[PDB]
């Protein structure tokens, strides 16, 4: 009857929602890791500039 | 980064060693030339003493 066209999409939604949440979480994690790496590169360059700074 | 710092440190070790050697050589030159000029002055005084001895002779 009228229940099945709703149940099908309802179950379509759950796994898609979980997969989207997992993907966005993992992408955010990668983004933060890259941010830390970039800050580290800036730190290395600035530490070199600050240590040498003519001697 | 990483290798750049080590390369700079090598370039600085060369700096210190070369500068120290230059300074030490300069001190050596000063000492040696002072030695030579004092010896020359001693030679001059000996010439004058020889002249006085020649006069008394």
UniProtKB/Swiss-Prot annotation, chain A:
Origin superkingdom: Eukaryota
Which of the residues bear the PTM Phosphoserine? 23, 42, 54
Cellular localization per UniProt: Cytoplasm, Cytoskeleton
Record PTM text: Phosphorylated at Ser-54 by DAPK1 in response to oxidative stress and this phosphorylation enhances stress fiber formation in endothelial cells.
Record's note on what induces expression: Induced in stimulated quiescent cells.
PTM-bearing positions, type Phosphotyrosine: 32
Similarity comment text for this entry = Belongs to the tropomyosin family.
Q: Outline what the protein does.
A: Binds to actin filaments in muscle and non-muscle cells. Plays a central role, in association with the troponin complex, in the calcium dependent regulation of vertebrate striated muscle contraction. Smooth muscle contraction is regulated by interaction with caldesmon. In non-muscle cells is implicated in stabilizing cytoskeleton actin filaments.
Q: What else is known?
A: The sequences of cardiac and skeletal muscles are identical.
Q: What is known of its domains?
A: The molecule is in a coiled coil structure that is formed by 2 polypeptide chains. The sequence exhibits a prominent seven-residues periodicity.
Q: How does it assemble?
A: Homodimer. Heterodimer of an alpha (TPM1, TPM3 or TPM4) and a beta (TPM2) chain. Interacts with HRG (via the HRR domain); the interaction contributes to the antiangiogenic properties of the histidine/proline-rich region (HRR) of HRG. Interacts (via N-terminus) with LMOD2 (via N-terminus) and TMOD1 (via N-terminus).
For this entry, the protein name equals Tropomyosin alpha-1 chain
Q: Which residues of the full protein are shown?
A: 230 to 284 of 284
């Amino acid at each position: 009857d009228k229940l099945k066209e709703a149940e099908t999409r309802a179950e379509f939604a759950e796994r898609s929602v979980t997969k989207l949440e997992k993907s966005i979480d993992d992408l955010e994690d990668e983004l933060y890791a890259q941010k830390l790496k970039y800050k580290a590169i800036s730190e290395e360059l600035d530490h070199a500039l600050n240590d040498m700074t003519s001697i | 980064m990483d290798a750049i710092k080590k390369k700079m440190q090598m370039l600085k070790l060369d700096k210190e060693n070369a500068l120290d050697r230059a300074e030490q050589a300069e001190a050596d030159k000063k000492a040696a030339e002072d030695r030579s000029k004092q010896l020359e002055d001693e030679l001059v005084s000996l010439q004058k003493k020889l002249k006085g001895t020649e006069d008394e002779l």
